[PDB]
Write a protein that binds this ligand. Structure first.
Ligand SMILES: Nc1nc2c(ncn2[C@@H]2O[C@H](COP(=O)(O)OP(=O)(O)O)[C@@H](O)[C@H]2O)c(=O)[nH]1
Ligand SMILES: [Mg+2]
Lengths: 430, 69
């Protein structure tokens, strides 16, 4: 009965957050009304991790919905699984954040954050043994980015001994809403490096390229992007939601994945890559899963793993398959490409198997890699940042909210430090 | 961090207020300078017109002085 409190902040945060709850509610046999109608006890054995029980055996997501405008949250309440959410956990303002980190972190969001922390507290008090928190948000906007990291800092103050986890969507000009996204992202990363234990880096650059090149979607929507996110999120939380030996809770995952405190930005991967309604008929063989899950084309962060080294890896296979063949294939990857795994962390690849597959598939595999190649992501954001900041472009939006140019300089420097720290261990030898 | 967060928002308040202030002062100063300038322009105009009246009195005075002689 180790509970996780979920928070979703902003448009992006609530969009994927909603899809996340749709997917796993279906995996746990919970319907839009909160009633269980599954055919396996494995579905309810660890249901308490993400759900609260009410009278009539109703299952209520331990989820808090946050935004500075009511737009997306009204869409969620009118969505398929809208009713399932605890109505009082809908915490929203009216002013919006205007894609402005400063508005979310210092002014507009500061006004709303206490209200959110009240709901968090009411949830946490009900917990038998709170593991920690998972946050879904984008880093390119204002609310999810600015207020999201504000929440994280406050939550760490009240719950300093609990694990902080995030699903952070990284901005990309291929799907850009605004030109100030590199600013918001750089300021957010600065917060994440300090105040999170585990961050899944979900790059919109990657999600777009996957949708276009692989899934052959000529005009990718956010729905096409979130089909990939929800599928990844379900996968990385499998070990948390079902019985298992490996990475069964947030802390044990952190201990396995995070050799150094600042280097906790994970590169997720998923196989097989599918589009919505594709409904493919041939299951993949265990060898096929293993080759694809490690393939660059299946990474949700636009980084080439062959350009860096793996510090740690977590692989999760779902569905009825040969655990013997899985072990063999996993051992085969490491032994065939041993150069890409740091030799000074022995046996840094851990594998889990879950009998229950995701809907629409007989076989699937989820990848979680702590690679030094993730620096490519932060480099990219840093280049976009400096291109504008060298001319102090668009800063007036931020100085108008009380921010000083120094705070940008500090944020940039810390991210450039993160990049250099990754490069340090990419060259390190035993 | 909490102290810095307070320092940022109260700086935003301070700058918004200082803008409102200086705008209010700039305007009141402009409307006062304009008032004094326009009144001075009108005052000078009448001052010249009133010297025409004085001159006209001297003309009629000068005629009366030339008459009996
Ligand atoms: N994958 C995905 N990304 C999104 C979505 N909505 C916005 N974004 C990304 O998030 C950034 C905009 O942030 P947004 O969530 O709209 O700002 P906020 O709601 O004020 O926190 C951009 O970089 C977008 O690419 C979404 O539904 N899906
Ligand atoms: Mg938006």
């Amino acid at each position: 009965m180790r509970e996780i409190v979920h928070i979703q902040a902003g448009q992006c945060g609530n969009q994927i957050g909603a899809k996340f709850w749709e997917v796993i509610s279906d995996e746990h046999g919970i319907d839009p009304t909160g009633s269980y109608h599954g055919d396996s006890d494995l579905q309810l054995e660890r249901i308490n991790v993400y759900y609260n029980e009410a009278t009539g055996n109703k299952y209520v997501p331990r989820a808090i919905l946050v935004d500075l405008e009511p737009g997306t949250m009204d869409s969620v309440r009118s969505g398929p699984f809208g009713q399932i959410f605890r109505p009082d956990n809908f915490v929203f303002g009216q002013s919006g954040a205007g894609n402005n980190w400063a508005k979310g972190h210092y002014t507009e969001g500061a006004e709303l954050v206490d209200s959110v922390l009240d709901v968090v507290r009411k949830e946490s008090e009900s917990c038998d043994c709170l593991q920690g928190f998972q946050l879904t948000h984008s880093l390119g906007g204002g609310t999810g980015s600015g207020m999201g990291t504000l929440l994280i800092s406050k939550i760490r103050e009240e719950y300093p001994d609990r694990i902080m986890n995030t699903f952070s969507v990284m901005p990309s000009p291929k799907v850009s809403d605004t030109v100030v996204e590199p600013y918001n992202a750089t300021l957010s990363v600065h917060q994440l490096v300090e105040n999170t234990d585990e961050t899944y880096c979900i790059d919109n650059e990657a999600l777009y390229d996957i949708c276009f090149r692989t899934l052959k979607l000529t005009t990718p929507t956010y729905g096409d992007l979130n089909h990939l996110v929800s599928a990844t999120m379900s996968g990385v939380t499998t070990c948390l939601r079902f019985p298992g030996q490996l990475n069964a809770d947030l802390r044990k995952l952190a201990v396995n994945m995070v050799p150094f405190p600042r280097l906790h930005f994970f590169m997720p991967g998923f196989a097989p890559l599918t589009s919505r309604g594709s409904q493919q008929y041939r299951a993949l063989t265990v060898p096929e899963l293993t080759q694809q899950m490690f393939d660059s084309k299946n990474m949700m962060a636009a980084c080439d793993p062959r350009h860096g080294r793996y510090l740690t890896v977590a692989a999760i296979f779902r569905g009825r398959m040969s655990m013997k063949e899985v072990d063999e294939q996993m051992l085969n990857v490491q032994n065939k490409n041993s150069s890409y795994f740091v030799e000074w962390i022995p046996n840094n690849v851990k594998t889990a198997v879950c009998d229950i597959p995701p809907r629409g598939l007989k076989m699937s595999a989820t990848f979680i890699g702590n690679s030094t190649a993730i620096q490519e992501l932060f480099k990219r954001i840093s280049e976009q940042f400096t291109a504008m900041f060298r001319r102090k472009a668009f800063l007036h939006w931020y100085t108008g909210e009380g921010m000083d140019e120094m705070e940008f300089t500090e944020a940039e420097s810390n991210m450039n430090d993160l990049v250099s720290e990754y490069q340090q261990y990419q060259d390190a030898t035993a | 961090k909490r102290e810095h967060e307070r320092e940022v928002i109260q700086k935003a308040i301070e700058e918004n207020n200082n803008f409102i202030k200086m705008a209010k002062e700039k305007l009141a100063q402009k409307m006062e300078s304009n008032k004094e300038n326009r009144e001075a322009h009108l005052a000078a105009m009448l001052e010249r017109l009133q010297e025409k009246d004085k001159h006209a009195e001297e003309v009629r005075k000068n005629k009366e002085l030339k008459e009996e002689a």
